[PDB]
């Protein structure tokens, strides 16, 4: 309705599934369409990461050199020297989304196969990492699987808790979500981007009153050096809101 305005007034596709949890409802544009999930994976190949490790396996320092340097290195760069332990390399990927910490997180849990196999673990059959499908998924997929980990039950409770806290002091997205949300409004967040004008934020909300809700943004264009612009994640929101509300 107004999410058609958006994609007009952006120039854009919009994929959109929010869920209100104490209460089921839903609100869902274009839920099952797909996108490609862009940096928004790093949320979930964190949560299979704590599956796999005690906390104290993430005091593991791991050692890397200047060849594990891809394009955006933001916390990772500083350190080759050092190194970095996996709980430094989940907070710098999440929080920050170093890809090349992303690359390191994979590379230990053993890689994209792995992670597909694991995701469907869980009940994920479109999550899709390796009419192209090759690395997309759906607003759908991604806020039942952000909720498996974060909210539900396939992570023990002080892992859960590690996640969330990552996830509340993201960097990475106050120009998105946490703009369509007002003063006072938790939200835990993970952002993707790329070309064709990919822009995303996948995300939990919490209203000082009670139930959280659990919702994903995407969008992307035309068109494939077009870049993108955040308002459209913001207002985007601003609908789910009240739409919720
Ligand atoms: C997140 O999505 C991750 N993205 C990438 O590195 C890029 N593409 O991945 C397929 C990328 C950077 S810009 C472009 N054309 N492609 C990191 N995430 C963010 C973010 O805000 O979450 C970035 C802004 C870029 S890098």
């Given at each position: 309705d107004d999410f058609a305005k958006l994609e007009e007034q952006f120039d854009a596709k919009l994929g959109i599934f929010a869920l209100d949890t104490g209460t089921n409802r839903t609100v869902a544009y274009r839920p099952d369409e797909r996108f490609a999930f862009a940096s928004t994976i790093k949320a979930l190949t964190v949560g299979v990461l704590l599956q796999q490790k005690s906390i104290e396996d993430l005091n593991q320092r791991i050692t890397y050199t200047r060849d594990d340097l891809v394009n955006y290195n933001p916390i990772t760069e500083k350190h080759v020297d050092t190194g970095m332990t996996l709980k430094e390399l989940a907070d710098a990927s999440l929080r920050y989304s170093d890809n090349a910490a992303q690359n390191l997180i994979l590379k230990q849990i053993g890689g994209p196969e792995s992670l597909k196999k694991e995701l469907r673990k869980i009940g994920d059959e479109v999550?899709?990492?390796?009419?192209?499908?090759?690395?997309?998924?759906?607003?759908?997929?991604?806020?039942?699987?952000?909720?498996?980990?974060?909210?539900?039950?396939?992570?023990?409770?002080?892992?859960?808790?590690?996640?969330?806290?990552?996830?509340?002091?993201?960097?990475?997205?106050?120009?998105?979500?946490?703009?369509?949300?007002?003063?006072?409004?938790?939200?835990?967040?993970?952002?993707?981007?790329?070309?064709?004008?990919?822009?995303?934020?996948?995300?939990?909300?919490?209203?000082?009153?009670?139930?959280?809700?659990?919702?994903?943004?995407?969008?992307?264009?035309?068109?494939?050096?077009?870049?993108?612009?955040?308002?459209?994640?913001?207002?985007?929101?601003?609908?789910?809101?009240?739409?919720?509300?």
């Open positions: 999550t899709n990492p390796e009419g192209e499908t090759q690395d997309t998924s759906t607003a759908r997929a991604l806020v039942t699987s952000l909720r498996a980990f974060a909210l539900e039950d396939k992570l023990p409770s002080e892992k859960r808790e590690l996640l969330i806290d990552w996830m509340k002091r993201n960097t990475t997205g106050d120009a998105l979500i946490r703009a369509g949300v007002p003063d006072g409004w938790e939200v835990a967040d993970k952002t993707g981007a790329a070309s064709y004008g990919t822009r995303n934020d996948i995300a939990i909300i919490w209203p000082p009153k009670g139930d959280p809700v659990v919702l994903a943004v995407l969008s992307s264009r035309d068109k494939k050096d077009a870049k993108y612009d955040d308002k459209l994640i913001a207002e985007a929101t601003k609908v789910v809101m009240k739409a919720l509300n």
